[PDB]
Design a protein around this motif. Structure first.
Motif, PDB file in Angstrom:
ATOM      1  N   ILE A  75       0.848  -1.182   0.000  1.00 52.93           N
ATOM      2  CA  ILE A  75       0.000   0.000   0.000  1.00 52.93           C
ATOM      3  C   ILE A  75       0.888   1.239   0.000  1.00 52.93           C
ATOM      4  O   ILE A  75       2.066   1.190   0.361  1.00 52.93           O
ATOM      5  CB  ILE A  75      -0.973   0.013   1.201  1.00 52.93           C
ATOM      6  CG1 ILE A  75      -2.176   0.912   0.908  1.00 52.93           C
ATOM      7  CG2 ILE A  75      -0.256   0.448   2.468  1.00 52.93           C
ATOM      8  CD1 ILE A  75      -2.937   0.520  -0.332  1.00 52.93           C
ATOM      9  N   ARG A  76       0.305   2.357  -0.426  1.00 50.52           N
ATOM     10  CA  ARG A  76       1.027   3.609  -0.597  1.00 50.52           C
ATOM     11  C   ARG A  76       0.209   4.763  -0.035  1.00 50.52           C
ATOM     12  O   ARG A  76      -0.993   4.638   0.218  1.00 50.52           O
ATOM     13  CB  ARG A  76       1.354   3.861  -2.074  1.00 50.52           C
ATOM     14  CG  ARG A  76       0.151   4.255  -2.917  1.00 50.52           C
ATOM     15  CD  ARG A  76       0.347   3.850  -4.370  1.00 50.52           C
ATOM     16  NE  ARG A  76       0.016   2.448  -4.593  1.00 50.52           N
ATOM     17  CZ  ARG A  76       0.300   1.778  -5.701  1.00 50.52           C
ATOM     18  NH1 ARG A  76       0.931   2.350  -6.713  1.00 50.52           N
ATOM     19  NH2 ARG A  76      -0.055   0.499  -5.795  1.00 50.52           N
ATOM     20  N   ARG A  77       0.895   5.893   0.151  1.00 48.32           N
ATOM     21  CA  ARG A  77       0.323   7.162   0.624  1.00 48.32           C
ATOM     22  C   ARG A  77      -0.695   6.957   1.745  1.00 48.32           C
ATOM     23  O   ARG A  77      -1.774   7.551   1.766  1.00 48.32           O
ATOM     24  CB  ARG A  77      -0.280   7.970  -0.535  1.00 48.32           C
ATOM     25  CG  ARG A  77      -1.386   7.295  -1.340  1.00 48.32           C
ATOM     26  CD  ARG A  77      -1.665   8.056  -2.628  1.00 48.32           C
ATOM     27  NE  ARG A  77      -2.949   7.697  -3.216  1.00 48.32           N
ATOM     28  CZ  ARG A  77      -3.105   6.811  -4.190  1.00 48.32           C
ATOM     29  NH1 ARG A  77      -2.073   6.172  -4.716  1.00 48.32           N
ATOM     30  NH2 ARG A  77      -4.329   6.562  -4.651  1.00 48.32           N
ATOM     31  N   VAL A  78      -0.328   6.112   2.703  1.00 48.57           N
ATOM     32  CA  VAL A  78      -1.152   5.864   3.872  1.00 48.57           C
ATOM     33  C   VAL A  78      -0.637   6.708   5.028  1.00 48.57           C
ATOM     34  O   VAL A  78       0.488   7.216   5.016  1.00 48.57           O
ATOM     35  CB  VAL A  78      -1.190   4.367   4.253  1.00 48.57           C
ATOM     36  CG1 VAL A  78      -1.990   3.587   3.232  1.00 48.57           C
ATOM     37  CG2 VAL A  78       0.222   3.812   4.365  1.00 48.57           C
ATOM     38  N   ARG A  79      -1.475   6.858   6.045  1.00 46.91           N
ATOM     39  CA  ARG A  79      -1.175   7.697   7.194  1.00 46.91           C
ATOM     40  C   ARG A  79      -0.689   6.851   8.364  1.00 46.91           C
ATOM     41  O   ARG A  79      -1.023   5.671   8.495  1.00 46.91           O
ATOM     42  CB  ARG A  79      -2.408   8.505   7.605  1.00 46.91           C
ATOM     43  CG  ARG A  79      -2.815   9.570   6.600  1.00 46.91           C
ATOM     44  CD  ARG A  79      -3.877   9.051   5.644  1.00 46.91           C
ATOM     45  NE  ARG A  79      -5.059   8.567   6.347  1.00 46.91           N
ATOM     46  CZ  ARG A  79      -5.995   7.802   5.800  1.00 46.91           C
ATOM     47  NH1 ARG A  79      -5.918   7.413   4.538  1.00 46.91           N
ATOM     48  NH2 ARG A  79      -7.033   7.420   6.537  1.00 46.91           N
ATOM     49  N   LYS A  80       0.119   7.479   9.221  1.00 46.04           N
ATOM     50  CA  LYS A  80       0.590   6.801  10.424  1.00 46.04           C
ATOM     51  C   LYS A  80      -0.569   6.484  11.361  1.00 46.04           C
ATOM     52  O   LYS A  80      -0.587   5.426  12.003  1.00 46.04           O
ATOM     53  CB  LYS A  80       1.645   7.652  11.129  1.00 46.04           C
ATOM     54  CG  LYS A  80       2.174   7.039  12.415  1.00 46.04           C
ATOM     55  CD  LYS A  80       2.796   5.676  12.154  1.00 46.04           C
ATOM     56  CE  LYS A  80       3.193   4.994  13.453  1.00 46.04           C
ATOM     57  NZ  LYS A  80       3.599   3.578  13.235  1.00 46.04           N
TER      58      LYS A  80
END
Ligand SMILES: Nc1ncnc2c1ncn2[C@@H]1O[C@H](COP(=O)(O)OP(=O)(O)O)[C@@H](O)[C@H]1O
Ligand SMILES: Nc1ncnc2c1ncn2[C@@H]1O[C@H](COP(=O)(O)OP(=O)(O)O)[C@@H](O)[C@H]1O
Ligand SMILES: Nc1ncnc2c1ncn2[C@@H]1O[C@H](COP(=O)(O)OP(=O)(O)O)[C@@H](O)[C@H]1O
Lengths: 508, 485, 508
Positions: free
Chosen positions: B271-276
């Motif tokens: 997955i990409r451009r996910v948030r902490k």
């Protein structure tokens, strides 16, 4: 701890400023801009944007009043007056302690009683042309000159009657006003179908064309086989000659398509295919289209094509490559009017018997601004009348009855909310008093006469602004919008309660 | 200076307490905000009142900060905390002018706080847990008088299902609860009835081209902060991932189509451009592990997570559904509507009820509101101070006589006289032993709160009292402000 | 234009000053003289007479109010409050036009209606001890301490009941109040007969005189000598030193004439020959006559002598002779009392028992004066109640009922006088509001409770000035004087009208 006094004082000042504006005999206000531009107006909807307001809570009242009357557009000045009178009536009792919360409870109870009472004084009828004429007259004489509004009443009511499809309300786009600068006002006529803002001034424009068609043109003489419109590439020799040929063949390769389409629809443009362009066209192409009965036109507006798309049929999209003969916009009749200096295009008998436009006309902006917002208010008022099936008597007749009903309902409520409803009923009487005062009559004598008449006879009697006499307000035809009165009550109560509930103004 | 600084601190406390002293209860009065441009703000919330106003005294700033920290910790009650702290610090003025030391006042205040804690835990009415009956009763009591009265039928059952989605079983019986790990999904559009619940983490990010084995019947998630490149000439990390044979490996960098094929060769979904704030809840709900150092790489690098994965593009937008997670501690809650102006408030009050529920798991107790609890504990202290002697008895009694400010202001911002009503309330609260009556906030009339139907969680009341007492003792412990101006 | 506003402000200020005195629970005011003397009192008349008022029109209002109150019993503070509220209510409408003549006509119409209503409201209950006890309690608790008032009620009512035997309106002369400074104020009762201010220096003349005869005639035991010859003891000293003699022979001749009268009409040395002189008498002849049983006294004022003439009888002249015993009168007991250092002559059980005095023994001067004024007001109130033979409920009661009658009578009148009627009603509302405020309760809450209770009961209901709840004044025992209410309405209307009619202020 008494900032309620400051708030009440500022509200009363705002009331004093916006007074002397009600009814057909209201005094106009003189709006001068900082630069030097001038403006004359009477309605509060635009008056509450009077450059400077000074007191901040007065600005708050103006802001909320405008934001909430944007839904009906007729109760602004009445809203401000009733707010000020409610605050004054509350103050007469706040001065002797009497914490404002129970005053607020009384206000809410009085509002409930008034809303209950409104539902039985409204008269619901199968309203016809004459009733809408009376409604438009009442809404127009109170925003523009008395004699002038008479001619606009007809042009409003017939336009709304034509526009009225069915129970569904009207649309803002579906009626459009137009601006022009003729020397004389020359009334205001109604045009069926869309009216175009601008046009080309070639000598060979076809005037009388029947069963015509139309297509929108975006960019035709700038770039060859490219929809981009920008500066010419003089430096690039291959591009420089391409754009020179774009002057001729970029328009010819689709003028041939236009002429073949118009021929195969009707021999040599027998029905007179018409065209519209976003911007100017080639002078040779203009001459060819004029000689071919195509009527090239320029200076198209962004609000024209989407309005005429469902009005003239098909889709008159900006882009070229017509190709399939389905997007062509049918026009039963098109005319070119060139009154004085400017020329206009009249698109009549399009694929819609609706979407009509007005023809407001007169001297420089100082008058046509009043014309336009007055006719807008008249249209919105008659739209409210067309939406609801019930209308209420005007001239403050309904409010005298409301005050009487609240007074009779006062002993029902226990506690000091009794006193609250007393104050609310007393404050609702400001509109008849202001109406009487603005015509020069005695403020209290007229109210006493009206109250006596309504007490002895159940007819909702109102004030007559030519003789200062109690008038029935039903036979005279001074009806007001029901929804406007309802929203007036709802707005005034909430604003008054909110202002009464504040304390300890703080410098953030 | 000496006691002059104490008096100044508590005077700042008093002058900041009465600013918002009027805006509590169901009939709160409005306040005026006058910014130096001309704008004017209507406000009922004292929290925003304190936030917008500017102060110069360090004592006022410290009290505002403690009110905030109480706000985002337990939820409501900030106005009550400020009022109580101001009242105790104001009634300490009398003793600080008796030329008697702040230390004995502090000891008396601490004893009073302990006795108030005891008498609250004694007077609290019990409530059942996992039972919708008095859960809805509490909803009627506290979750009402908000903007939820029109949407209480949905807020109630949303919270009642949400109570069992954030539990940690660490040291006892479901006593640990964490606050942000609930997967909030606030999206406008459609009807509000579309809001629902799901057991699993709901990720708004998705792969650009889902032409690969995204969902596997046993997601064994592996977290990695590395960036996926073209190849080694990095496929070496993928080759090392192949060693433990997982099915899903979560990264935080973009994935290309050829990178997608290289990943599906190992059968792992990135997955990409996910948030902490999404990665942490994913790990919490899945119990995964993140490691990239080759020496530390062992059989522990793969931790089994969910058991079912699904992707649905509801309204041409890339959702990702991770249901049946191993740990039901970070699970999906759905929000639907038109505007976020009220749904946020309804949400926040629902997690307030969530904290209510977890404290009910700890202490299933409710305290009678409307000033009932305040006068009950004041009576308890006043009757308790009779037996105890010493010079510190006066502050002990004064704390009790000061805590009755809540019913006093409830009566005050209602219209009724605050003297006669308070005297009558005390009269039917001393000799009447087993009643614990309160004052109606609407009509300003005494009414037994067991009949009116208003109650408050025990924990919020305890936190408010403790924070008020600690603020009072802190402001009495400051002997000098001077480190400059 | 502005003089009216000035007058309104001054009247409101005077009302605010006098507000906290109405009702038995009202707070007293302290009047400190310029010299330093202090007077503490609450009666409206003395406050308006002795106050150092600054505003001129306020002084005018006070003067006319006290002048009209001198006619009836009392009710001054209520009158001033009603005038103030009348002016405020009138100004509330005058601010929006309403030439004051309209308000004046409304006031006169409301006055007529209120007088009529009071006619139908009065109670014609008969004569008895208990109702007059209640009247005295009502008139006394509004002026002095509660327990002291309870003590004074019995004495006042018994004195007036005794004087009532003539069946004609009689007072003032026939009831006198004596002044003395005993430490214990509890001693207060009626002394049937007459008490002289002071006696004379006499060693044990008679003590208990018992039956005796009174002739007075200003005995000349210190007859006027011939001291005045020329200025003073000049060189011709033998005139004022020797010619001053030969007048002691006149004194001795008067002594033998008194002897002849005594042992001529008395028949023996007993049956004391009571005589009083306005000037001094020598102790020698005093004791010489005392040994013969003659009751010789000296140094009394006129008023006691005219009192003795109408009670016992006797001529009065310094130089006299052996006149006829026709003017001689007889008394049952002429006992002489002494308290510490001052001597009292108790002339009791005389003929014409109408003359009766009252005993008060206040500790200090200001308490004595306050008790004297409270007794006078109670006597006037009971006298009025007996004279009219009709009493009306107090504690408001009549005020709110008149208000309801006026409000229901408002639509009856024509023109704008309804405004004046409404103002008059709201002004009469002030009394129950002031009572509730001075008790310690809320204005509007108590007023609403009273009006609501009066709504479905019909019977007169007033404020209970210890709990605030409505109470029926007939059962509790609070009563007012009908003549007081009549004078109140008349005077308040007259003064309010006169203040409202003014338009300009000019110096003179
Ligand atoms: N011919 C008329 N006779 C009596 N009253 C009228 C007449 N025309 C308008 N009015 C009064 O004018 C009022 C509406 O004007 P107003 O509320 O001032 O418009 P706005 O608030 O949009 O400026 C109504 O209350 C109506 O009673
Ligand atoms: N219906 C009601 N009647 C009486 N008191 C109420 C009622 N609703 C709430 N209260 C009182 O309001 C107080 C808390 O309100 P407040 O502290 O202003 O809200 P918040 O905690 O969000 O700041 C409680 O002490 C409670 O007793
Ligand atoms: N016990 C009582 N309870 C309630 N009201 C009373 C009582 N006694 C007297 N009053 C009211 O006090 C008023 C008279 O007070 P005040 O004006 O001071 O007397 P005045 O001016 O006649 O000397 C009366 O109108 C009466 O209604």
């Amino acid at each position: 701890q008494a900032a309620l006094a400051v708030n009440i004082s500022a509200a009363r000042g705002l009331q004093d400023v916006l007074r002397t504006n009600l009814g057909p005999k209201g005094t106009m206000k003189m709006l001068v801009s900082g630069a030097g531009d001038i403006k004359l107006t009477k309605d509060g909807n635009v008056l509450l944007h009077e450059m400077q307001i000074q007191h901040p809570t007065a600005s708050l009242i103006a802001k909320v009043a405008t934001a909430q009357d944007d839904i009906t557009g007729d109760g602004t000045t009445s809203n401000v007056l009733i707010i000020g009178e409610l605050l004054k009536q509350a103050d007469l009792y706040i001065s002797e302690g009497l914490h404002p919360r129970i005053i607020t409870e009384g206000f809410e109870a009085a509002k409930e009683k008034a809303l209950q009472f409104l539902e039985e004084v409204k008269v619901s009828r199968e309203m016809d042309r004459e009733t809408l004429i009376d409604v438009a007259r009442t809404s127009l004489r109170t925003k523009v000159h008395a004699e002038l509004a008479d001619v606009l009443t007809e042009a409003v009511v017939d336009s709304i009657l034509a526009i009225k499809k069915q129970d569904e309300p009207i649309d803002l786009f579906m009626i459009e006003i137009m601006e022009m600068k003729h020397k004389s006002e020359t009334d205001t006529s109604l045009i069926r179908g869309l009216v175009l803002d601008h046009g080309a001034r070639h000598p060979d424009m076809k005037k009388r064309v029947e069963d015509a068609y139309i297509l929108t043109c975006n960019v035709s003489l700038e770039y060859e086989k490219t929809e981009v419109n920008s500066g010419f590439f003089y430096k690039s020799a291959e591009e420089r000659e391409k754009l020179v040929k774009a002057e001729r063949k970029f328009i010819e390769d689709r003028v041939k398509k236009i002429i073949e389409l118009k021929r195969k629809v009707c021999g040599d443009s027998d029905k007179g295919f018409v065209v519209i362009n976003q911007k100017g066209i080639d002078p040779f192409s203009l001459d060819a289209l004029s000689k071919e009965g195509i009527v090239a036109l320029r200076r198209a507006k962004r609000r024209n094509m989407e309005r005429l798309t469902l009005a003239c049929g098909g889709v008159a999209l900006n882009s070229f490559d017509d190709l399939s003969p389905d997007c062509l916009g049918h026009a039963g009749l098109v005319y070119e009017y060139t009154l004085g200096e400017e020329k206009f295009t009249f698109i009549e008998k399009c694929n819609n018997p609706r979407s009509v436009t007005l023809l407001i006309k007169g001297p420089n902006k100082h008058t046509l601004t009043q014309i336009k917002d007055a006719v807008r208010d008249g249209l919105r008022a008659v739209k409210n009348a067309i939406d609801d099936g019930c209308v209420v008597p005007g001239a403050g007749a309904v409010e005298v009855a409301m005050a009487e009903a609240l007074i009779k309902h006062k002993p029902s409520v226990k506690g000091r909310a009794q006193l609250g409803v007393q104050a609310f009923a007393d404050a609702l009487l400001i509109i008849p008093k202001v109406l009487a005062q603005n015509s020069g009559f005695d403020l209290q004598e007229t109210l006493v006469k009206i109250q006596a008449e309504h007490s002895e006879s159940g007819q909702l009697v109102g004030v007559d602004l030519n003789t200062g006499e109690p008038m029935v307000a039903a036979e005279v035809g001074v009806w007001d919008n029901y929804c406007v009165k309802k929203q007036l009550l709802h707005s005034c109560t909430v604003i008054a309660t909110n202002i009464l509930l504040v304390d300890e103004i703080m410098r953030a | 200076s000496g006691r002059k600084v104490q008096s100044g601190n508590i005077n700042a406390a008093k002058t900041i307490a009465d600013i918002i002293r009027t805006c509590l209860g169901p009939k709160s009065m409005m306040k005026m905000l006058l910014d130096p441009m001309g704008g004017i703000v209507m406000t009922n919330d004292g929290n925003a009142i304190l936030r917008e106003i500017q102060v110069q005294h360090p004592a006022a700033k410290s009290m505002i900060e403690i009110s905030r920290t109480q706000d985002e910790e337990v939820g409501d009650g900030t106005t009550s905390v400020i009022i109580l702290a101001g009242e105790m610090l104001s009634v300490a003025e009398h003793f600080l002018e008796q030329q008697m030391h702040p230390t004995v006042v502090i000891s008396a205040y601490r004893k009073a706080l302990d006795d108030m804690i005891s008498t609250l835990k004694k007077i609290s009415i019990p409530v059942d847990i996992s039972d919708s009956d008095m859960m809805l009763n509490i909803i009627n009591s506290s979750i009402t008088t908000k903007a939820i009265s029109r949407w209480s039928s949905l807020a109630c059952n949303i919270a009642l299902d949400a109570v069992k989605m954030v539990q940690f079983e660490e040291n006892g019986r479901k006593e640990i609860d964490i606050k942000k790990y609930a997967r909030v999904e606030k999206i406008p559009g459609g009807i509000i009835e579309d809001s629902c619940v799901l057991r699993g983490v709901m990720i708004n990010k998705d792969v650009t081209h889902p032409r690969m084995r995204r969902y596997i019947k046993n997601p064994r998630i592996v977290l990695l902060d590395s960036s996926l490149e073209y190849k080694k000439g990095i496929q070496q990390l993928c080759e090392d991932i192949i060693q433990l044979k997982p099915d899903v490996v979560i990264t935080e960098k973009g994935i290309s189509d050829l990178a997608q094929h290289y990943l599906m060769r190992a059968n792992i979904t990135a997955i990409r451009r996910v948030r902490k704030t999404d990665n942490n809840r994913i790990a919490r709900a899945c119990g995964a592990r993140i490691v990239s150092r080759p020496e530390e790489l062992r059989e522990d690098d793969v931790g089994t997570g969910a058991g079912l994965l699904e992707i649905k593009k509801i309204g041409d937008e890339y959702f990702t559904f991770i249901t049946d997670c191993k740990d039901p501690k970070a699970c999906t809650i759905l929000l639907r509507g038109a505007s976020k102006e009220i749904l946020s408030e309804v949400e926040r009050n629902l997690q307030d009820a969530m904290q209510v529920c977890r404290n009910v798991l700890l202490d299933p107790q409710l305290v009678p509101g409307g000033g009932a609890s305040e006068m009950a504990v004041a009576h308890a202290l006043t009757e308790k101070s009779k037996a105890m002697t010493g010079v510190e008895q006066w502050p002990y009694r004064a704390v009790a006589q000061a805590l009755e400010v809540i019913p006093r202001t409830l009566i005050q911002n209602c219209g009724a006289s605050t003297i006669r009503l308070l005297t009558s309330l005390r009269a039917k609260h001393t000799q009447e032993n087993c009643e614990t009556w309160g004052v109606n906030g609407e009509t300003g009339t005494l009414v037994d709160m067991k009949e009116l139907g208003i109650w408050e969680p025990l924990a919020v009341k305890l936190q408010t009292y403790k924070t008020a007492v600690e603020t009072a003792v802190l402001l009495l412990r400051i002997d000098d402000i001077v480190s400059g101006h």
